[PDB]
Design an enzyme around this catalytic site. Structure first.
Site, PDB file in Angstrom:
ATOM      1  N   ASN B  10       0.826  -1.202   0.000  1.00  0.00           N
ATOM      2  CA  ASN B  10       0.000   0.000   0.000  1.00  0.00           C
ATOM      3  C   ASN B  10       0.864   1.257   0.000  1.00  0.00           C
ATOM      4  OD1 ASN B  10      -1.997   1.964   0.295  1.00  0.00           O
ATOM      5  ND2 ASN B  10      -3.197   0.741   1.750  1.00  0.00           N
ATOM      6  N   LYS B  12      -0.430   4.036   0.133  1.00  0.00           N
ATOM      7  CA  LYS B  12      -1.257   5.001   0.850  1.00  0.00           C
ATOM      8  C   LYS B  12      -1.312   6.269   0.023  1.00  0.00           C
ATOM      9  CE  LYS B  12      -0.604   2.700   5.134  1.00  0.00           C
ATOM     10  NZ  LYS B  12       0.050   2.578   6.463  1.00  0.00           N
ATOM     11  N   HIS B  95      -9.867  -0.733   5.315  1.00  0.00           N
ATOM     12  CA  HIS B  95      -8.618  -0.345   5.963  1.00  0.00           C
ATOM     13  C   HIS B  95      -8.846   0.543   7.188  1.00  0.00           C
ATOM     14  CE1 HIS B  95      -4.080   0.143   5.490  1.00  0.00           C
ATOM     15  NE2 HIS B  95      -4.391   0.870   6.548  1.00  0.00           N
ATOM     16  N   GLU B  97      -7.345   2.924   8.456  1.00  0.00           N
ATOM     17  CA  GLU B  97      -7.251   4.368   8.236  1.00  0.00           C
ATOM     18  C   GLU B  97      -8.621   4.952   7.902  1.00  0.00           C
ATOM     19  OE1 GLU B  97      -4.033   4.031   5.557  1.00  0.00           O
ATOM     20  OE2 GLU B  97      -2.647   4.126   7.253  1.00  0.00           O
ATOM     21  N   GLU B 169      -4.487  -6.211  10.406  1.00  0.00           N
ATOM     22  CA  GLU B 169      -3.521  -5.189  10.747  1.00  0.00           C
ATOM     23  C   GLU B 169      -3.765  -4.742  12.176  1.00  0.00           C
ATOM     24  OE1 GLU B 169      -3.789  -2.042   7.904  1.00  0.00           O
ATOM     25  OE2 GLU B 169      -3.400  -3.355   6.197  1.00  0.00           O
ATOM     26  N   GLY B 175       2.421   1.983  11.960  1.00  0.00           N
ATOM     27  CA  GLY B 175       3.037   3.299  12.062  1.00  0.00           C
ATOM     28  C   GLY B 175       3.875   3.549  13.304  1.00  0.00           C
ATOM     29  N   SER B 215       3.659  -2.677  10.056  1.00  0.00           N
ATOM     30  CA  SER B 215       5.049  -2.603  10.495  1.00  0.00           C
ATOM     31  C   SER B 215       5.877  -3.824  10.082  1.00  0.00           C
ATOM     32  CB  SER B 215       5.110  -2.426  12.015  1.00  0.00           C
ATOM     33  OG  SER B 215       4.271  -1.363  12.427  1.00  0.00           O
TER      34      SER B 215
END
Lengths: 254, 254
Positions: B10, B12, B95, B97, B169, B175, B215
């Site tokens: 990804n 992003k 996702h 996010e 995830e 992150g 990660s």
């Protein structure tokens, strides 16, 4: 006092590579004067394709949406810098669909527009009221609160309003069964420029562009151009048809 | 009960056209086996460009997001039909996010996967819990729920799970560099596959690809891959770095 005529095209979630190629070519060939600004907003997946098709000096591509964050951990999002890196100047913000359907707050719409404005982009900042709100009588209440969020976010740096084109969407006539009257549209546009002068800059309230995204047609538009405080159109569905070139023609004649 | 390994990257909301060309070509220039599924997600703006840079016969481009409606008045929204028109087979869904930051409901994510699945796309469905949830001990409960909403939408056409890839995830892991130990990563996949055999099917469960997201990196990736129920990786940060190609070597060898 003249402001510059500005017409936008919103494709929304429409098009394929071939339609982009054929439609962009179609508009590009239409003779476009230099007294008028023409923009079309293709879908993100089609920006690169539309841009290849634009053999025009006069016409320019815009994007329907952008995010209030720079490049980062924002999956499913575009940033101003991705837009600018591709050479895009205009982007649409606050469209009724994203606000009304997709839960996009006035703050996110205003936060988004400011960010782009900081970096030199022109924002078609979209506002409008639904039938429930028109019926309540908060026509002004609703639009101004959308606008006020932008005033608040832009804040001190009021230079930025310079790159803003206001788009009034008559959301209450979108298949409510009620159509707008040029009188009703104009009345709103007067009411909005009044807000801007009164609460932002009286001098610059004559220089801002406000366009009517309100079921404008090949006809009922020659009338709409006549409305003095209507500076042009944000077309939606008709922006996908050759009717769109004719709408462009009207703006010039009017 | 052999699963074909699957590594997805990804970008992003990151990239420039030039970057996209160079990196996509650096990845394409890498020797990718027919044993592993490789997919990369650039922004919608860079999709065309990424597809043009892609000279590989194994590598595929994906989308980081898709809308739950078709073509029409969804300004700022991409449709599966646009995707497939562009030649895309993979799209990323659900996702964290978008879930945890932008307000995508579980069903909003479920209706997107189903619609894209109906039209025969291979969907990278994302599940995951926050640091709190794990502490409240509500991991399986949360992951199951996000997983359940897809079941509910799928309903009778349960085979649409065949072209589902699941990405767990950890929300905390992403992150923050802090990451899930192999003991931990594996722990979740068993429960999720436990769920799949239990609630969906006991033969299909053997074949559903659950990949671990967050990660993921060199050295660390290595034991992660050895875990017998971790079928691959969804990479964010390193997908942007030349590291990604390394990661594919590890996945295959394993």
């Amino acid at each position: 006092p003249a402001r510059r005529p500005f017409i936008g095209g919103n494709f929304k979630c429409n098009g394929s590579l071939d339609f982009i190629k054929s439609h962009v070519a179609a508009i590009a060939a239409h003779k476009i004067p230099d007294s008028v600004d023409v923009v079309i907003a293709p879908s993100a997946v089609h920006l690169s394709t539309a841009i290849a098709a634009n053999t025009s000096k006069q016409l320019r591509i815009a994007a329907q949406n952008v995010y209030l964050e720079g490049n980062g951990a924002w999956t499913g999002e575009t940033s101003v810098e991705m837009l600018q890196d591709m050479g895009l100047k205009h982007v649409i913000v606050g469209h009724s669909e994203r606000r009304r359907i997709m839960g996009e707050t006035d703050e996110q719409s205003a936060k988004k527009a400011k960010r782009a404005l900081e970096k030199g982009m022109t924002v078609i900042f979209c506002v409008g009221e639904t039938l429930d709100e028109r019926k309540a009588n908060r026509t002004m209440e609703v639009n101004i609160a959308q606008l006020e969020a932008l005033g608040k976010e832009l804040g001190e740096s009021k230079m930025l309003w310079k790159e803003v084109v206001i788009a009034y969407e008559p959301v209450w006539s979108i298949g409510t069964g009620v159509v707008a009257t040029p009188e009703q549209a104009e009345e709103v546009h007067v009411g909005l420029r009044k807000w801007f002068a009164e609460k932002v800059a009286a001098e610059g309230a004559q220089h801002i562009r406000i366009i009517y995204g309100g079921s404008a047609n090949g006809s009922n538009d020659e009338k709409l151009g006549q409305c003095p405080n209507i500076d042009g159109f944000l077309v939606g569905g008709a922006s996908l048809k050759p009717e769109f070139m004719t709408m462009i023609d009207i703006l010039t004649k009017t």
